[PDB]
């Protein structure tokens, strides 16, 4: 996307989201990132929404195919096609991780940008961990954990307990604990403490901020209900 203006890439990313063309949206936002300038709050959201949708479709397909593959092991085609989807998913995760590493994270100094990008880093290593089975599942899990932990440490120091980025980070780290790290007690403890500390901070918020925070707190509650 080197020949397109940064502002045109952003505008077309918004159009692609309206058209539910998330592959296009991601390519436009990748081009915007590669312009080398930092991203605004809105632009960070566009980047995240685009790749979240793309990899979300790949994860859903991988789970369908992995389930069929396991039912068959109780020709090579099911395995081959699951492998193809898995390779494409890993390529998307690697692309996002490459954008964070070159050079979004190192230029992100404010808590809102740095925590957001590090949560992203944890998320895309978590997606890699979901399909990892070889000599590097452990290293991938530790890469996810390390990114989440750095984001957690910054968010505790720099953000109020109701901050939506802080809440969504804790939500996803708790999912990491439950689904990836085989630590359901840590997952439940994190979700509970996150919810309770946000509840106690709600009195400080405007009507609109209250709606933003309580919406995410409900997602923590839904998980706790499923886990207990």
């Amino acid at each position: 996307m080197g020949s397109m203006e940064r502002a045109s890439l952003i505008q077309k990313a918004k159009l692609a989201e309206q058209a539910e063309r998330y592959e296009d949206m991601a390519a436009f936002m990748k081009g915007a990132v590669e312009k080398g300038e930092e991203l605004s709050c809105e632009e960070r959201n566009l980047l995240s929404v685009a790749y979240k949708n793309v990899v979300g479709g790949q994860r859903a397909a991988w789970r369908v195919l992995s389930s069929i593959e396991q039912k068959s092991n109780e020709g090579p085609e099911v395995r081959e096609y699951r492998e193809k989807v898995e390779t494409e998913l890993q390529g998307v995760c690697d692309t996002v991780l490459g954008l964070l590493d070159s050079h979004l994270i190192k230029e992100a100094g404010d808590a809102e940008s740095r925590v957001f990008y590090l949560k992203m880093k944890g998320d895309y290593y978590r997606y890699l961990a979901e399909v990892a089975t070889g000599d590097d599942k452990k290293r991938i899990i530790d890469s996810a954990r390390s990114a989440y932990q750095e984001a957690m440490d910054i968010s505790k120091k720099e953000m109020p307990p109701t901050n939506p980025i802080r809440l969504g980070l804790a939500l996803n780290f708790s999912v990491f604990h439950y689904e990836i790290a085989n630590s359901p007690e840590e997952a439940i403890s994190l979700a509970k403490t996150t919810f309770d500390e946000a509840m106690a901070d709600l009195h400080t918020l405007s009507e609109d901020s209250y709606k933003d925070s309580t919406l995410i707190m409900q997602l923590l509650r839904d998980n706790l209900t499923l886990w207990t």
């Binding site: 959201n45 929404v49 979240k52 949708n53 997602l219 499923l226």
Partner: peptide, 9 residues
């Protein structure tokens, strides 16, 4: 178990 939906912008 639900992660944060990066559904809409």
């Amino acid at each position: 178990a639900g992660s944060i939906p990066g559904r809409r912008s």
